[PDB]
Design a protein around this ligand. Structure first.
Ligand SMILES: CCCCCCCCCCCCCCCCCC(=O)O[C@@H](COC(=O)CCCCCCCCCCCCCCC)COP(=O)(O)OC[C@H](O)CO
Ligand SMILES: CCCCCCCCCCCCCCCCCC(=O)O[C@@H](COC(=O)CCCCCCCCCCCCCCC)COP(=O)(O)OC[C@H](O)CO
Ligand SMILES: CCCCCCCCCCCCCCCCCC(=O)O[C@@H](COC(=O)CCCCCCCCCCCCCCC)COP(=O)(O)OC[C@H](O)CO
Ligand SMILES: CCCCCCCCCCCCCCCCCC(=O)O[C@@H](COC(=O)CCCCCCCCCCCCCCC)COP(=O)(O)OC[C@H](O)CO
Ligand SMILES: [Cu+2]
Ligand SMILES: [Cu+2]
Ligand SMILES: [Cu+2]
Ligand SMILES: [Cu+2]
Lengths: 213, 235, 244, 244, 214, 212
């Protein structure tokens, strides 16, 4: 049909960059005058609203995305044909591309941002504006997406369906041990090698040695 | 603004602030003001806070809304850390110059090395004007003036961006001339030498020569501009 | 026809777009991982112009820097023979820092870019990458690669830093521009005493502060490179296990 | 007849007595190892009601507590699917301490039980064991198992500890009953300065002392759990070697 | 004949719990007034007597138990029948049950006891009452028993007869590195029971197995 | 022809012991009154001359020794006969003997010597007389030899020709991580490798029978 669709990626990329752009823009606005006194009632209405919202909402998205993908799991996964596997691998790379961007925001942008907010307050609590976004939003978000990608591969790709890719295990569970110190998850190295092995195999001796040379 | 959350007994039994005063409570961008006052180093200093043998005077303020221009405590100009003796009193003052239009709450602050921030009285200080208009400036030893708001920033970009661009070029170069997938495959199949033979090494050997050269040059040049520099002044 | 691709266009077209998606997703990815690691350890000397001293900075930065450049080379080179491991990682970091310094330190909190610009790594990264290209060996890279990496840190940074080391007299005291910038643009939580910059010792003999720290970082970076090269390998593992 | 057993009685009877012998022998066993390890590290806060503070104690105990629970699970669950590893360990410790506090701290040296009662672990032990039962996974236990273990530590202790945090005025000073008990019942080698309990800081903001400590112990217990799970495995090794 | 005897276990359990009970009771008595001044001659007659006795006596018990079990080793151990092996495993579990109890006393009781004696003296030496019992008695005791169990298995069970069980090796030599700090842990009993459990599994037929115990 | 020559070893042993004796004798002379003030011009003429000479000279000897041995490498190395291998092994042991002596001087003699010079100055620089000899001479020298012996093996002995002996790698690269602050007792594994080849090259007859 189409091996490469990409509409799902775009959807996610747009829906993410946009969301964070809102968040960043919003913190420009309610950062100064709203997020400096954590004992004021304006803090409750503009920052503690977000904290109370996002955590339960993230935990539901996580298990939701979870269950859904187990349920729609391919119950006869070894039967999958070379064209259907090739399609599924490309959807897996899509998931990973979104993972990359979520990692960029959570681990670079909102992480180093907190560095500068520390030079702008003496802190009434550990729920500052930046911590609310960094630890309790951007981090859980890329964590959810990590799990998504993991279960996609688990439930659609035979290589991933039996046994557990160690690299991928580390990638999806790594996140829940980033909360201490506040190891690293370069485990994506091994997951893309695993994807590249399948690709190598699914391309015939012809596509391989001959066509791409 | 944090002070409320800080432990009550530590706030009472460390620095005791008196006679705090704000030259003005409204100021234009570029206009000066002084925060000043006295402080008494409590005689029964709490275990939890290191001896104030190493401390630092500061403007408790939400980022540089007001630029500090100078400060003084114990009758010294205090851009670096100072000792406070337990039991004694010291007088201090901080010259602030308006930068960012708004209504900010500006405190007197002292940080102790073993212990953290101790927050004095603060006061609302309105600032009027447009930050576009804000300047310093500052006189070098050679006699010339510079505006610190902008000084040096061009030269930074001029060095950083070209390098990042060079960095990007090189990555793109290899990513194009050889694939990711093609390269993986070649390597996995056995060769490997199909991916990299000289004159890929010739290209690398040349880029490196060019890089070293550009480094020597840029060093020498920045050495001619600016031929007399000092190390950061610390202690 | 070349199954599972209908046409030769569908084949080469697919390859070409998965190539992009890998490059990108791996580009950050390592950046997220590199940044958090670096930011947590090498701080801090990278955030602030008034910590960019002659001793600590050209020591902790090269040594903490080389880590993901080594792991990233273990990845690109072993598996794809692609000679951009070090620059892939170093560039990732530079962009994630710059974006942040600009959009946040400045755009959000209004610190001048002269206070908060990052250290320069790309030149050392190139040396690292070309040494791996020319010799084909990570043992050689570990030795001469990581030595050049350390030596070249301060020179490739000098051009960006020299302007701020011009001298000024303030209230009868000598200060560098860098000290003053620090001093002027008030940080709530940065007392001068916290810095961890060179403050003098009765065992400095010269005149020699930078080149000793340069060579020190160079030699130590050899060990860290080894250890991180092999961790790049472990992270590139394709082992499947059987339970949890 | 079912060789090497003469009868079906002899089979079932032998199985039933060896079952008892294993339980018991393994029960302590892990108690002896658990106790020594724990006693040497978590001390000390466990011995003395006047160390049972809000910061140190609910930190070091959960973290040092989870070790032998994790290993005990790795053994009971992997090889027997029996869901009581944590409770096997935590109960053994409690018994070994209580016996001692009573027979020795008090029976021998006459310190009141109110000075020397141990920290309560059985609730968190349960949460740990059930998370392993429900999920079938050590990874999930490692995460949500050890997090609950952490969080529940102070709550499951409060009932035993609250009595002694009632205020009293001695000679113009405020004291807890707990300070006063320690004070009254003279220990030769226990100077008040040696305690290692919360004494305040300029960075506490609240009101938050116990909750941050509980979460901190939770998050750190995850790592220790992992490590000790796998060590439970290593210790479960059936490897036979060939020389010494 | 009898796969399960147990008399040996009982003998050891009784002969142990009783002995320590004496010792604990005796230290209640000569702890207070006898064991507080280590420079008094009452310390020599009530506490230093024990130290000088137990160490040589323990070193002889240890090598004794060792040599005897090597000597009475089954010289043709592979021939052992399923009923005779099943008996020998049950004796080994006995040995271990005694090891468990000796570990309880050495590593819990007399160890945490020393914690409370430290709050009762300022110490004239490191031979206090409690150290005399703890390091120099209760610890060597459980150490001897660990060696015993190890050698029983080595000399009676074919699995343990050739090669060395790693988990057992750690269990019997672990002890001699507990003397550092003060100044690893021997949960190696985990692997030993699993090794025992493997033997049991095999010696029970496909019938006793899958069928009978289900 | 001759399985054991030894003239090469003697040459090296003589050429080294002698050289270092000169160096040691020389530092007796110009150590006192020449090497106490590093700001005096006599320091330049008697100590900094050596530093500037030896480093380039060592780097050229090192690559020289390397290239030469690669170029004269045995291009058909598996063809080597049991008597020719046996000879080359004995030359390899000769290289190693020299290695041992160069390790002795570099890591024992001039290293512990610096311990005593530190008690005789307060130091104008890190280029003291002892450091000049220790770090920048004796050390590079035994490092050059280590590489020599490694390449000899690589280019003359089949076992060493294909693959890299780990021990020997660690022995020959080890050196370049002594400049920080592991240890290179990697000679253990190299002599066992040499001993395996000797075992095999002696017939079942030489072996079990003759040496018993
Ligand atoms: C032993 C476990 C049992 C426990 C049960 C709990 C389960 C745990 C977690 C399971 C999560 C697994 C996720 C993997 C499946 C992906 C399915 C899907 O939704 O993606 C679609 C497409 O996938 C995409 O293209 C993904 C592109 C990347 C973006 C995806 C995520 C976007 C997230 C955007 C950010 C919003 C933030 C959300 C998080 C808070 C469908 O593709 P398909 O190939 O299955 O079938 C197509 C069609 O139906 C057949 O014709
Ligand atoms: C006992 C301390 C050392 C004494 C000093 C040296 C003298 C050595 C004495 C050796 C006697 C120890 C017991 C070993 C005898 C055989 C092993 C045995 O114990 O099992 C028997 C019965 O099973 C037992 O009950 C096992 C013992 C239970 C565990 C208890 C250990 C002993 C307790 C020691 C307490 C010491 C402390 C007392 C307080 C001071 C069955 O014997 P077998 O099956 O090996 O016979 C086969 C052989 O090939 C034929 O020759
Ligand atoms: C106008 C003057 C210009 C000077 C030009 C010279 C510049 C120097 C360039 C460096 C070139 C390196 C040449 C080194 C050759 C080594 C020889 C060899 O490898 O060993 C032979 C002998 O090896 C030995 O046993 C030597 C063992 C001891 C090694 C000693 C090394 C030198 C020690 C001195 C160190 C430096 C300090 C000295 C003081 C300055 C055995 O060779 P083979 O078995 O492969 O050959 C086969 C044979 O011909 C027929 O059977
Ligand atoms: C100011 C600081 C200076 C630091 C300089 C230190 C430089 C030393 C770097 C440490 C690495 C030394 C050991 C490297 C391993 C040996 C390299 C090798 O394997 O030899 C190759 C041969 O090619 C060459 O390298 C030719 C020799 C000249 C190159 C010199 C590199 C060695 C460095 C020696 C210089 C020592 C300087 C010391 C002075 C301080 C083998 O070729 P092949 O793989 O095709 O053969 C097949 C093989 O048998 C089966 O796999
Ligand atoms: Cu933060
Ligand atoms: Cu305020
Ligand atoms: Cu003691
Ligand atoms: Cu020295």
């Amino acid at each position: 049909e189409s091996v490469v669709d990409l509409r799902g990626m775009w959807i996610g990329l747009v829906l993410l960059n946009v969301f964070y752009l809102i968040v960043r823009i919003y913190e420009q606005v309610f950062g100064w005058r709203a997020g400096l006194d954590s004992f004021a009632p304006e803090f409750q209405t503009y920052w503690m609203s977000i904290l109370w919202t996002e955590i339960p909402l993230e935990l539901v998205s996580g298990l939701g995305l979870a269950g859904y993908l187990w349920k729609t799991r391919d119950r006869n996964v070894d039967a999958v044909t070379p064209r259907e596997e090739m399609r599924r691998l490309v959807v897996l790379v899509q998931w990973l591309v979104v993972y990359g961007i979520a990692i960029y925001w959570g681990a670079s942008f909102f992480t180093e941002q907190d560095g500068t907010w520390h030079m702008t307050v003496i802190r009434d609590t550990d729920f500052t504006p930046s911590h609310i976004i960094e630890f309790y939003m951007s981090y859980p978000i890329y964590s959810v997406i990590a799990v998504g990608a993991f279960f996609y591969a688990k439930t659609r790709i035979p290589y991933f369906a039996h046994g557990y890719s160690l690299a991928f295990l580390i990638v999806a569970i790594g996140p829940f041990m980033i909360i201490p110190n506040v190891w690293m998850a370069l485990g994506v190295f091994g997951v893309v090698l695993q994807i590249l092995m399948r690709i190598h195999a699914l391309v015939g001796k012809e596509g391989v040695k001959l066509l791409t040379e | 603004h944090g002070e409320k959350s800080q432990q009550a007994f530590l706030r009472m039994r460390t620095l005791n602030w008196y006679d705090v005063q704000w030259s003005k409570t409204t100021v234009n961008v570029n206009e000066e003001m002084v925060l000043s006052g006295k402080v008494h180093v409590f005689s029964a200093w709490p275990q939890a806070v290191a001896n104030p043998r190493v401390s630092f005077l500061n403007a408790g303020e939400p980022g540089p809304v007001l630029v500090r221009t100078a400060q003084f405590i114990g009758e010294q100009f205090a851009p670096r850390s100072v000792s406070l003796e337990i039991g004694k009193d010291y007088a201090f003052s901080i010259n602030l110059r308006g930068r960012r239009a708004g209504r900010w709450h500006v405190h007197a602050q002292i940080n102790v090395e073993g212990g953290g921030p101790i927050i004095g009285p603060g006061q609302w200080i309105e600032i009027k004007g447009d930050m576009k208009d804000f300047t310093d400036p500052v006189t070098l030893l050679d006699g010339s003036t510079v505006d610190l708001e902008h000084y040096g920033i061009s030269r930074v970009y001029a060095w950083h961006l070209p390098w990042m661009a060079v960095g990007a070029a090189w990555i793109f170069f290899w990513f194009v001339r050889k694939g990711i997938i093609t390269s993986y495959i070649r390597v996995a199949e056995g060769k490997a030498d199909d991916v990299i033979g000289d004159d890929d090494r010739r290209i690398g050997a040349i880029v490196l020569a060019l890089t070293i050269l550009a480094t020597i040059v840029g060093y020498a040049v920045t050495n001619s501009t600016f031929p007399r520099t000092i190390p950061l002044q610390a202690g | 026809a070349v199954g599972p691709f209908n046409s030769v266009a569908e084949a080469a077209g697919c390859v070409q777009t998965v190539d992009w998606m890998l490059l990108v997703l791996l580009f950050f990815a390592v950046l997220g991982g590199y940044h958090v690691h670096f930011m947590l350890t090498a701080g801090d000397w990278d955030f602030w112009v008034d910590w960019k001293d002659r001793r600590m900075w050209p020591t902790v930065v090269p040594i903490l820097g080389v880590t993901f450049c080594a792991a990233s080379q273990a990845f690109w080179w072993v598996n794809f023979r692609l000679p951009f491991g070090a620059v892939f990682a170093a560039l990732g970091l530079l962009i994630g820092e710059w974006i942040n310094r600009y959009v946040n330190f400045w755009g959000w909190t209004y610190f001048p870019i002269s206070l908060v610009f990052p250290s320069a790594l790309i030149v050392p990264a190139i040396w690292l990458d070309v040494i791996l290209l020319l010799s084909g060996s990570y043992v050689i890279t570990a030795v001469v690669g990581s030595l050049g990496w350390g030596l070249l840190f301060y020179p490739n940074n000098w051009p960006a830093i020299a302007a701020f080391h011009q001298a000024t007299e303030q209230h009868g005291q000598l200060m560098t521009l860098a000290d003053l910038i620090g001093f002027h643009f008030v940080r709530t939580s940065m007392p001068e005493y916290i810095r961890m910059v060179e403050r003098g010792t009765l065992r400095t003999f010269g005149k020699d502060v930078v080149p000793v720290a340069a060579f020190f970082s160079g030699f130590v970076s050899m060990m860290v490179y080894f250890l991180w090269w092999f961790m790049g390998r472990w992270y590139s593992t394709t082992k499947v296990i059987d339970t949890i």
